[PDB]
Amino acid sequence: ESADLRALAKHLYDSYIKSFPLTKAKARAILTGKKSPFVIYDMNSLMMGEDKIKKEVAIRIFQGCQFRSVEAVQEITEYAKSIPGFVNLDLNDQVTLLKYGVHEIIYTMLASLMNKDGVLISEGQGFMTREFLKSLRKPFGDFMEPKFEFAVKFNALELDDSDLAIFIAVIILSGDRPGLLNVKPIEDIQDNLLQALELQLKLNHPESSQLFAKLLQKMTDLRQIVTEHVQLLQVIKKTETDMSLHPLLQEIYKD
Amino acid sequence: PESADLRALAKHLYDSYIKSFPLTKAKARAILTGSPFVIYDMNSLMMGQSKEVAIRIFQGCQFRSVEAVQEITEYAKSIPGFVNLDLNDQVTLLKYGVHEIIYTMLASLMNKDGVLISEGQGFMTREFLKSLRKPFGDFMEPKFEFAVKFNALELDDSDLAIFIAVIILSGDRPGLLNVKPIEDIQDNLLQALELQLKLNHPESSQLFAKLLQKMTDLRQIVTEHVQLLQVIKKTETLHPLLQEIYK
Numbered sequence: 001e002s003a004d005l006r007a008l009a010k011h012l013y014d015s016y017i018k019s020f021p022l023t024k025a026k027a028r029a030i031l032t033g034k035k036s037p038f039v040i041y042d043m044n045s046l047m048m049g050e051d052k053i054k055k056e057v058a059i060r061i062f063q064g065c066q067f068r069s070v071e072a073v074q075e076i077t078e079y080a081k082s083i084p085g086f087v088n089l090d091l092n093d094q095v096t097l098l099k100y101g102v103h104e105i106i107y108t109m110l111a112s113l114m115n116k117d118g119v120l121i122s123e124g125q126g127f128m129t130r131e132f133l134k135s136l137r138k139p140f141g142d143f144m145e146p147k148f149e150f151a152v153k154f155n156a157l158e159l160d161d162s163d164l165a166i167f168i169a170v171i172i173l174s175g176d177r178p179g180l181l182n183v184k185p186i187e188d189i190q191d192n193l194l195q196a197l198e199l200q201l202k203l204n205h206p207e208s209s210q211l212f213a214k215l216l217q218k219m220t221d222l223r224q225i226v227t228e229h230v231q232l233l234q235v236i237k238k239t240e241t242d243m244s245l246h247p248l249l250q251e252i253y254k255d
Numbered sequence: 256p257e258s259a260d261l262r263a264l265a266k267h268l269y270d271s272y273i274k275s276f277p278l279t280k281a282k283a284r285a286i287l288t289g290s291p292f293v294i295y296d297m298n299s300l301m302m303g304q305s306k307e308v309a310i311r312i313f314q315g316c317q318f319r320s321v322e323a324v325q326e327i328t329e330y331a332k333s334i335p336g337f338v339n340l341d342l343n344d345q346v347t348l349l350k351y352g353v354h355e356i357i358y359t360m361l362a363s364l365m366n367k368d369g370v371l372i373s374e375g376q377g378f379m380t381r382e383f384l385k386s387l388r389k390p391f392g393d394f395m396e397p398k399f400e401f402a403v404k405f406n407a408l409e410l411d412d413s414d415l416a417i418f419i420a421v422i423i424l425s426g427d428r429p430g431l432l433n434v435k436p437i438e439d440i441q442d443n444l445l446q447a448l449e450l451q452l453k454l455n456h457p458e459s460s461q462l463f464a465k466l467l468q469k470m471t472d473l474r475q476i477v478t479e480h481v482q483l484l485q486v487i488k489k490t491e492t493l494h495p496l497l498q499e500i501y502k
């Protein structure tokens with residue numbers, strides 16, 4: 001079965017590259033200055049970068065994150081279809097799996113695009129500093145800090161895209177999502193994905209003790225990030241009466 | 256290339272096809288021949304503003320067609336040389352090839368009176384499909400038209416496994432980056448397909464040619480299916496995640 005686990009791992013990695021244009025290997029190539037990004041760290045550079053790469057600074061930064069999230073949901077959906085068993089599950093659950101999964105997966109892969117100092121934007125054409133993202137006005141104060149704090153700790157695991165491909169498959173196939181109708185089909189798929197992640201982790205990181213365990217523990221951090229963000233969204237929703245949330249994201253958010 | 260190698264290629268493709276496609280032509284034909292539950296009627300579908308039946312049947316086809324795409328994708332990975340192709344080209348070959356393959360294989364579930372549904376457990380008649388209000392009665396009928404002509408060739412699963420591989424490795428899909436290796440592989444599969452058909456159907460003259468002529472007909476069906484599929488976004492309009500799964 002060992003070889004069947006390796007074939008699973010090879011397969012998901014294949015679909016991962018096919019579904020997400022900006023990989024972790026590409027992000028790190030751009031980040032670790034070998035493709036150099038334009039750097040947005042203030043108002044004038046944000047607007048200079050609207051020319052050069054791509055008060056209302058917060059809204060532009062809002063919609064730019066909405067754009068990429070909608071886009072991200074679409075990639076994640078593409079990828080889910082490739083996971084063996086997914087498209088054979090009950091449709092209502094396939095939807096439930098995505099509704100809940102995409103949040104968690106988005107911060108996982110957002111880590112790939114982050115370092116200590118900032119975050120890659122516009123498929124790596126841009127780089128926005130962590131500081132500039134703290135500077136925004138205060139329904140949006142430090143909305144990004146907890147994602148940077150997670151990235152810092154998650155990135156020190158030193159996962160690569162082939163590790164990530166399996167980890168996010170495991171995330172999608174969570175049997176504890178609320179409202180799932182048939183938990184057992186989902187859990188059996190996850191079991192095989194977990195088996196494959198275990199082998200992959202040991203093979204790709206032989207001198208990295210309990211990497212499997214340590215990666216699963218990061219779900220605690222992931223979910224707590226999810227929760228605070230929904231709380232920030234609502235504060236906005238009450239006070240940004242004229243602002244707009246995309247219908248795909250609307251659907252993903254309504255608990 | 257040697258007949259042994261083409262026989263080996265032939266047999267290799269049949270193996271993968273049997274692993275990737277649970278409901279085979281042969282199985283489908285066993286079921287078809289004189290049970291599964293028959294849907295001939297509005298009350299038999301019912302007994303077998305939220306949503307009109309025609310849309311729910313449309314929806315269910317999209318679900319099943321998404322399952323077909325994953326079976327076909329997995330089968331492609333087994334074609335010698337496919338996974339060594341450039342990755343963008345594997346996506347492009349699949350993107351354009353899956354519809355043609357879906358309608359090819361749908362013929363395996365069809366006779367002139369209906370189609371097998373739900374893993375062979377059901378049978379929706381042809382006439383019931385036609386009953387459906389515009390443009391919903393007009394989506395399956397062309398497929399039945401093709402199926403009946405197609406099934407007259409009496410291909411089996413072993414034949415189909417190679418024909419399917421030939422469709423995927425089409426060098427003329429828009430946006431291919433490196434056509435040569437795709438045509439190279441397709442030539443090999445055609446080589447194999449031609450020997451398969453002479454050996455499997457020795458009394459069936461120019462089957463090879465006749466089969467290739469049907470690749471033409473499948474492109475017409477795919478093209479016009481789109482022109483029905485756009486008369487649908489048009490007059491038939493939401494739950495975004497769902498729409499995203501079937502983009």
Ligand SMILES: CC(=O)NC[C@H](Cc1ccc(OCCc2nc(-c3ccccc3)oc2C)cc1)Nc1ccccc1C(=O)c1ccccc1
Nearest residue numbers: 060061062064065066068069102103106120121122140249
């Ligand atoms: C599932 C899901 O929707 N999850 C919530 C989702 C998670 C997220 C967060 C950051 C991120 O950065 C990508 C890199 C990024 N790209 C830009 C960019 C690009 C072009 C122009 C300007 C800026 O800025 C950043 C930080 C990607 C995804 N967040 C949002 C999703 C929808 C709408 C808004 C948000 C916000 O984060 C937000 C930001 C400011 C004010 C209000 C809200």
